[PDB]
Design a protein around this ligand. Structure first.
Ligand SMILES: [Cl-]
Ligand SMILES: [Cl-]
Ligand SMILES: [Cl-]
Ligand SMILES: [Cl-]
Ligand SMILES: [Cl-]
Ligand SMILES: [Cl-]
Ligand SMILES: [Li+]
Ligand SMILES: [Li+]
Lengths: 118, 118
């Protein structure tokens, strides 16, 4: 019920929402650096880690105007635009794989979100 | 609230209860193989993975008599003896570390619990 069964036919899901730390680094352009030109960084990042990774929340499109318009329209696909800016990592698999994927993704995302580390 | 903050002063905890699959391998002595002589396997295993790892549930002491006695005494430390046989993995750390620890532990524990794999 709350146990993991290694022989289960269902994959497990792990999901996390990691705050982009704008408080600690007020002028650093996290959205630009994560997405990359054309979104190639985030594309590479998902390919290398095997996770779904998304930037969401106020500022995720950088374009205060387009964000305003899409919130205002009330469409639920855009409900996230009200949330604090954050990275949403989602993985699926049997336990061993799912944890390994999340671990990989989480550690790569840390590299972007603590940009002055080491 | 539900977000991970990478700058949080609190460590995160991950915990999992992985069923020992007695159904799939009815005669295999999982408890003996995980603990080892004197409990040195489980000791090594925690040292190598950095996780707390425990065998709990009916059969975890192999000694149907001692288990009977400790359940009967009603002490809550032994409430687990009523549960299905299982491995309880517990880790703590900031996100990246915590996931990496859980991933490592979970994958090592899989090796014991799917003993005919590869
Ligand atoms: Cl349970
Ligand atoms: Cl599924
Ligand atoms: Cl890793
Ligand atoms: Cl939330
Ligand atoms: Cl703590
Ligand atoms: Cl691993
Ligand atoms: Li910033
Ligand atoms: Li067994």
């Amino acid at each position: 019920e709350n146990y993991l069964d290694l022989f289960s036919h269902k994959n497990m899901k792990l999901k996390e929402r990691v705050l982009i730390p704008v408080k600690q680094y007020p002028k650093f352009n996290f959205v630009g650096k994560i997405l990359g030109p054309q979104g190639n960084t985030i594309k590479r990042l998902q390919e290398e880690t095997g996770a779904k990774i998304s930037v969401l929340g106020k500022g995720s499109m950088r374009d205060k105007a387009k964000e305003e318009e899409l919130r205002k329209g009330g469409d639920p696909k855009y409900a996230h635009l009200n949330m604090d800016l954050h990275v949403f990592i989602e993985v699926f698999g049997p336990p061993c794989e799912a944890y390994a994927l999340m671990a990989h993704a989480m550690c790569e995302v840390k590299k972007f979100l603590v940009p002055d580390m080491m």
